[PDB]
């Protein structure tokens, strides 16, 4: 069916400025195109229906325009309750079709990630189990790249990642990153070492611990 | 005025059927308007599946109708989804939805979880610094909570007295079974002279474990 495609994935400004989100389709869908805002933890909301309509409720920050092709929603003055999630979908054709979804994030300085890094504890190796774990805390913007060394060489098998979405103090990021082997294989090497690379820093940055050390 | 309310089994097995119920209140589903499924997967990705109109028609998502059906009760004031072959690429949020003038009421949704996992309780390890990585001032800890299913699990640090420093993650699979670690940076001043411990509740099994993160040897 007709694809819609969201260009700005993820877009972010400042409180008080002017956004312009896009949504293309690939065929002709005239004006039938409506935009459905999701604040996190919510279902989405009807925001402008018939490409221009503004939805009722809604405040006039919000503008959308175009036609057949290429839709647009504008944001006069962007504020808080306005990060969120920004979905535009067509329903001229049936198989009634959404895009890929705009994320809007705060912007704010950018800020190196405090790594930390964790042997497994004895009480998970008493039992057979190796996990190391490592945390990547409040840090900014996203992109960041984790990699783990063990004894100097990469490893991508037993990598578990997890990212928590912008926070909603600081606004920065965090993730974990973490490790899992079988006890055998880990008394087997001694040096692990989690390096991150971000933005903020020329060299990468790298958290380590030899196991032969208490 | 309008109001969707979704509910339906929160965990079954792959192959299995199940039904959706979407039950409205506040507007006669013969009156008028299309009644609508909607679902999203992990990641925000919306997907249609299909509705059926107050006069009785139904459509589907193409890719989707030698799977699911469409059916309603219009004296109760419901239509449901019914999914067969459930696949374990169907565990998502569903939404039930009225539409026309795009798609202007919707409910909370419901979780649905394909999986094949067996309620079992979770192993929670202490993670105590390796000794020698903390930068003066702030010493951060940690908890790691894996192998246990079904979601959610509860985790606080000192029953609730620690509140700021604290970072919990989204569960994660690892074989077929949720890992999630959570940790909270204190100052070097607290912790290895105050105790702190993690608590984490895995209602489901009924489990609540404390653990107390200790200097390691």
């Known amino acids: 069916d007709i694809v819609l495609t969201q260009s700005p994935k993820s877009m972010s400004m400042s409180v008080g400025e002017k956004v312009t989100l896009s949504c293309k389709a690939s065929?002709?869908?005239?004006?039938?195109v409506s935009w459905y805002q999701q604040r996190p933890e919510q279902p989405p909301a009807l925001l402008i229906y018939?490409?221009?309509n503004r939805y009722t409720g809604v405040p006039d920050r919000f503008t959308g325009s175009g036609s057949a092709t290429d839709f647009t929603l504008t944001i006069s003055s962007v504020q808080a309750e306005d990060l969120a999630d920004y979905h535009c979908?067509?329903?001229?054709?049936?198989?009634?079709?959404f895009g890929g979804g705009t994320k809007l994030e705060l912007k704010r300085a950018d800020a190196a990630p405090t790594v930390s890094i964790f042997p497994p504890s004895s009480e998970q190796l008493t039992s057979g189990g190796a996990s190391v774990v490592c945390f990547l805390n409040n840090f900014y913007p996203k992109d960041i790249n984790v990699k783990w060394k063990i004894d100097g060489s990469e490893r991508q098998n037993g990598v578990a990642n997890s990212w928590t979405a912008q926070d909603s103090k600081d606004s920065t990021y965090s993730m974990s990153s973490t490790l899992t082997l079988t006890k055998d294989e880990y008394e087997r090497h001694n040096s692990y070492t989690c390096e991150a690379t971000h933005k903020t820093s020329t060299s990468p940055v790298v958290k380590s611990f030899n196991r032969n050390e208490c | 005025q309008v109001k969707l309310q979704q509910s339906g089994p929160g965990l079954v097995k792959p192959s299995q059927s199940l039904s959706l119920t979407c039950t409205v209140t506040g507007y006669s589903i013969t009156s008028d308007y299309a009644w609508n499924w909607i679902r999203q997967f992990p990641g925000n990705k919306l997907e249609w599946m299909a509705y059926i109109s107050y006069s009785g028609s139904t459509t589907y998502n193409p890719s989707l109708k030698s799977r699911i059906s469409i059916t309603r009760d219009t004296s109760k004031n419901q239509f449901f989804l019914q999914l067969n072959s459930v696949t374990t690429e169907d565990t998502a949020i569903y939404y039930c939805?009225?539409?026309?003038?795009?798609?202007?009421?919707w409910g909370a949704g419901t979780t649905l979880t394909v999986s094949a996992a067996a309620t079992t309780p979770p192993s929670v390890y202490p993670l105590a610094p390796g000794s020698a990585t903390a930068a003066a001032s702030m010493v951060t800890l940690g908890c790691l909570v894996k192998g246990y299913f079904p979601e959610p699990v509860t985790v606080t640090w000192n029953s609730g007295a620690l509140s700021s420093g604290v970072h919990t993650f989204p569960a994660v699979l690892q074989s077929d079974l949720y890992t999630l670690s959570s940790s909270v940076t204190v100052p070097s001043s607290p912790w290895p002279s105050e105790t702190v411990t993690c608590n984490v509740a895995h209602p489901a099994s009924s489990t609540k474990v404390d653990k107390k993160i200790v200097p390691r040897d």
């Open positions: 065929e002709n869908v005239d004006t039938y």
């Open positions: 979908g067509q329903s001229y054709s049936y198989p009634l079709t």
């Open positions: 939805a009225r539409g026309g003038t795009g798609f202007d009421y």
């Open positions: 018939g490409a221009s």
